[PDB]
Design a protein around this nucleic acid. Sequence first.
RNA 1: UGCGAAAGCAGUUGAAGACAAGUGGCUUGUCGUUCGUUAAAAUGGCCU
Lengths: 231, 329, 86, 34, 493, 56, 59, 64
Amino acid sequence: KDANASHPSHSAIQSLSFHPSKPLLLTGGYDKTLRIYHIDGKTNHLVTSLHLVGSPIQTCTFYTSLSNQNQQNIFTAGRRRYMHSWDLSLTAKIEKFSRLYGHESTQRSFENFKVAHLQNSQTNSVHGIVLLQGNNGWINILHSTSGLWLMGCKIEGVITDFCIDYQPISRGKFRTILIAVNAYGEVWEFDLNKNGHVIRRWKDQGGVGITKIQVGGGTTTTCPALQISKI
Amino acid sequence: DSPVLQSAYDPSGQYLCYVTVALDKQRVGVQPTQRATWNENFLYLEDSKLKVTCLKWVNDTVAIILGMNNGEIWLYSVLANEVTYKFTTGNSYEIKDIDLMGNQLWCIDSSDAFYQFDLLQFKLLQHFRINNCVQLNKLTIVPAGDSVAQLLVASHSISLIDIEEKKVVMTFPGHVSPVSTLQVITNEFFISGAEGDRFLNVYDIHSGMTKCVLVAESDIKELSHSGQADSIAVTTEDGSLEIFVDPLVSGNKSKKSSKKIQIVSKDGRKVPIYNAFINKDLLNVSWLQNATMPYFKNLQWREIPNEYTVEISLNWNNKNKSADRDLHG
Amino acid sequence: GSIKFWDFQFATLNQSFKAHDADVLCLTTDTDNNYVFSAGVDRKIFQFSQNTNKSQKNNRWVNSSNRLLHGNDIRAICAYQSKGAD
Amino acid sequence: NYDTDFIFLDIESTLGVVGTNSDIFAEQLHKLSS
Amino acid sequence: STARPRIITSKAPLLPQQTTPEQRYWRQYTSAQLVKEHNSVTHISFNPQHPHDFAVTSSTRVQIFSSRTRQVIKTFSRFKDVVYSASFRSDGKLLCAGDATGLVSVYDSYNPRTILLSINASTHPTHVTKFHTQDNKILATASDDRVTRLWDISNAYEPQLELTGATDYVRTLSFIPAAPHLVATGSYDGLIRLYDTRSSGSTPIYSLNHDQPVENVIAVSPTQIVSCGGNNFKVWDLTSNKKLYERGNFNKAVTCLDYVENFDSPMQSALIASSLDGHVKVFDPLDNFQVKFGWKFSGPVLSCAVSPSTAQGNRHLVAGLSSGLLAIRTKKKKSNNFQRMMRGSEYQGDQEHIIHNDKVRSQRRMRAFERNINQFKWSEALDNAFVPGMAKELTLTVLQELRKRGKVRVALYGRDESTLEPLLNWCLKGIEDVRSASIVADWVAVVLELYGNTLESSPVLQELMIDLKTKVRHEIHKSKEAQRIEGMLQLLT
Amino acid sequence: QYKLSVVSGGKPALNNLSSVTGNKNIARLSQDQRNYIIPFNNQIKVYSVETRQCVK
Amino acid sequence: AVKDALRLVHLPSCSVFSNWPTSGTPLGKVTSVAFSPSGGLLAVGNEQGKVRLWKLNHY
Amino acid sequence: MSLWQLETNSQQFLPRLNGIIIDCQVLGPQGNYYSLILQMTENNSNSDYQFLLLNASDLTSKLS
RNA sequence: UGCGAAAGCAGUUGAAGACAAGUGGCUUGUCGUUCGUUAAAAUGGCCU
């Protein structure tokens, strides 16, 4: 059965994400509402539904932390200078991120974000980062709970898309790599568990107008790991 | 249609066990019917096509027996979260109904076979099958103490069965469709109700004669009877509840419902009741508030009016009033 | 007014500082590149330091200091550093 | 105050006034589901 | 943390003769039109129903003007003598005009060529003709025959009722607005008679003694009516036969009245009065018929009217003068593919459970002095004060904000001759006013405290200080003589 | 028939020591950081950060 | 950009599945897509406002 | 209350906090709260402190 | 500082010790020092 058949959408469905554990599907579009559906085979019903006024949404993501796997945030954002974060509690407590901590000129719209995990690498403490794709070549990485700007990674060209790769190192330590593509086809990989420094820079063979990069086969941002040893 | 595939109360109506699908796999959860005395962990069926066909509360480590569709009765403790023991028949046939009396579990098969298991010994005691009963989908033990004589089996047509002779001793005219509820009321009566009809009938288990017919005003999903036959509450297809008060007295051959309860929200949206529970003066109704999470309500059903409309508070357009901010933002 | 440090191989930015209020006309460094001094039309001289062992092992300049000494501009800056002259 | 009491304010600001089976299953489930 | 409080504009204690809401509303009736008629405009009526046209009765023609272009849409010129009264029926469908030969002629409105019927009333001139306001098929015409007549417009041969009884020159009718059997007529002997039409009709049920010869009688409530004649107007409770207000706020005789109800206004009701000396005034019936606004015109005003209660468009006040001209003052009032792509932007959360709202409201734009006081640019805030296009209260409030807030001296430190001349050249103008002169005093005192050497060097602010000295000399003569007047009426207590 | 009582709270009363900069805030968060334990000069107030009410 | 433009390419073999989607799959103008982490289950949202749902029976 | 990004020396402000900050500290495990003591020194006759934590996300006064 | 009214009316401004600079003393100046008396400045300014 069509998942949003129970409660129709009033716009084109711009983003779509499953929950990492629960049977929930979050849809959202330019009608500035976001809907969660308990999906099954027969009767995909609507769990809850939140209409953010004056804020059409373009990307919406279930985030679930690695430490306790008990937060269940929803980060959502559109063509705005803010990004909402709903804390799932089954009223609804949402917060708004609207401060680039000195970096507002290079981030004029919170549309293209991605959420990922990051490790402190002196403690074994992970925390979520949101990653915002900005104007020049910039990716502004900031904390997913405090909203503090952690670091920024600039590629040379027109930034078009990016993805997050993880690689394990030892027992309980992994490393986060940001993979960002020019429009022209040249790809930067930034190690960002340290300071956001480039470790590899390669070039796509062929390809001249590049719109979308993705990784897969392990833990992406859309197949997320529930436990840190499962990365 | 309802996401809750199977659901049943424990005796005394204190917990509700319910099987719902969760993104192509069945999951079995238990909720307390009153919090004043969430439970966020489920039993997960790990196969995409294994599913629960029946479930029964045992009575004292508390457990559920879940009759599956691969010839197995799983026995699952609820305080812990594992199937403690896996009864199996020799076959792969789905099992249509189970019951237990004391420690003696009985079950029916899709090949119309009867199996008996012992919960104290974890063993298949008996396996048999009887003639002219060929589409069985309900059994009910007629209670006679620790003796577990006289099963009562339905196939659209109820048949009383002596198990020492493995033979049929009475034959009741059932329905025109498969029987969906078949429950013993007193030591001389049993109620039965079929799939897709709104007529229960109470039969006399000693003669075969139908005492009375009970008429819901919508197709009956589940029923509960209070433990002393004085009240029967059925829940129907349109999400309503109908209480027949004292149905076993002299509205002479067929009785209508005495009380009818439905739930609406503050808006006008009618939520459906599934699977209520009744006892002496106390009635506990269940619905789903969000998509699959059950909410309950206790009611003194003897002092409510006849046409009762429960009102619940449910989010429809409410402005998200954050506690850290006044109304002016 | 921004001062940027770029990794030569990979040809890409490591970190950008928003230091001056107008143009940065001239900037220079010392011998072992523990400091970078910079100046322009907003007439302050900024000093960017990497002298800490953690700064050298992490490749992280910090915006250390800032002095106002000139009257109108700074169009030229240079550095000399020897055994009896720095 | 206008209902026959007198409030006073201390110098460290304390306002004062001069006036006129199933049970163990329930317990262990509320433990194990919290 | 809070938001920043806005800079509050310095308001002084209010002076007398402030702008009332009534006179603000009645003062936005502007853009006067003067249309020269052939003779004195005697009557003017409005269309009731689509209340958007008005008929002006000049001599020997009646012109319907539109209430959106103010030009003559239609005109009625086939009268033999001077046409006197012209009113629309309550349905606004046809137009009656009494003529100086005693020939009431009723046309249909918006068609001057179809004269519908010509009632031949008295041989005397018929001076007032109006339909019933409740009934549709009866027309009341009074004439210089000292007898009014009610005519059924089906049987237009004999009058269906003949209201006599008045001794001299009946010039006005009126109907009572809830009881349709009740006709109040007014004549040049005073004595508003009024008649129950179910009775004989040759005797009034009672009579109201306006002492002057009345010029008009209108009905305000179903109970109270207002008669104007002579220098005053009086109001009369009709259930108790008794006068209860009289306003005589004119010099010459009040020629006409009319009344408005429920229209979009601070005034819930309004009676305006036109009075042969140039004045038309508006009186508010809810606070005891007190006058709230007035217009003065270029000659003796003979008749006036306003747009009716349901005007819904361009709203008019018209006054026709005895000089032979007409004065109108009005108050006025991408792709289907792209839209399918950008569909949802007008939804606003109807079927949605929770609806979150944290879009902050966009406040008024900050002026340059306010954002400079915010950015702590205090000398730039003083510079932004003394631009030419600044309001006087705005210059005063940024001076007062720099005075209270920080330092006059900080705002005045880096200055010289060319950058002090705006301040002192404004202080010349601000020293005259009472509300500014304390701030002007301490600002001039501080600037001569810390620029006493530039006084010596530059001669072209020496003369500014001398002009300021003569200004304070004039102002101190004024502030001394005000204390003398204060004493000389303290003597008279 | 008249009786005196102290019924309403007072000042929060942090560490009133000299020579301690930084940590003079003796209020604590819980470990399951849902309620905030602040002392007063008359009592220990325990507020709840979810609902902003004093709960104990 | 166009209607029904969705392909599922099998890999490591790098070969597009040739039996789905067909000409009668109501994919629409595919403006989002999502995979379930456990069930083997596609959600495909189009410009009409419809999430269509499919289950891959390998999982 | 300013918070200095020590990489680029970049301040983020919170400007009108009805009292001078006599103590400020991060509080959470991830640092999601700031706790502050505000001395409110317009009256010189008493030392009256306001205790104000606030969530670090949108810098709103959670539990003053 | 005290009494006052928002005006005003009476009172002032010592000592010890340590340290710093200058030329063990002498001079000058300070004090997260004590006793007694009712007693201007580090280019450094306010969020989305």
